[PDB]
Amino acid sequence: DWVPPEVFDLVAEDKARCMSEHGTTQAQIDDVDKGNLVNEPSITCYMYCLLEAFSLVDDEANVDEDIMLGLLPDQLQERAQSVMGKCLPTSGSDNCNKIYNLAKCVQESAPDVWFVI
Ligand SMILES: CC(=O)CCCCC/C=C\C(=O)O
Numbered sequence: 001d002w003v004p005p006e007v008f009d010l011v012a013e014d015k016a017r018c019m020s021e022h023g024t025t026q027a028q029i030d031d032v033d034k035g036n037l038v039n040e041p042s043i044t045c046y047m048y049c050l051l052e053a054f055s056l057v058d059d060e061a062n063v064d065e066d067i068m069l070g071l072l073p074d075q076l077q078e079r080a081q082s083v084m085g086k087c088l089p090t091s092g093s094d095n096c097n098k099i100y101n102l103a104k105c106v107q108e109s110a111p112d113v114w115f116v117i
């Protein structure tokens with residue numbers, strides 16, 4: 001669980017662009033999924049890049065919560081909305097680092113569900 005496999009097809013093109021743009025390796029992504037976050041631009045800008053690709057964030061890494069909730073499964077919307085109370089607004093020294101700070105907040109608040117694609 002829980003991401004439907006269809007989402008991997010849907011993000012494939014943007015994922016390859018984002019990894020190429022930022023020098024991201026799958027190993028870095030697999031490590032964020034296992035809960036290990038580091039402030040490395042190659043992974044933090046990748047997370048911003050992918051989020052942007054789907055209008056989840058804007059040009060200053062403000063999260064669009066309406067879009068985020070509508071995109072999440074109908075079950076998680078409870079948790080989600082609660083974690084956005086704690087973790088939004090995003091904060092940091094640049095768009096990438098604002099997403100690093102977000103990621104570790106959400107990792108921390110919901111390890112059960114936490115995931116990056
Ligand atoms: C890096 C990460 O997990 C966030 C990407 C979210 C993309 C979801 C896009 C479309 C959908 O879920 O239909």
Ligand SMILES: [Cl-]
Pocket residue numbers: 091092
């Ligand atoms: Cl700021």
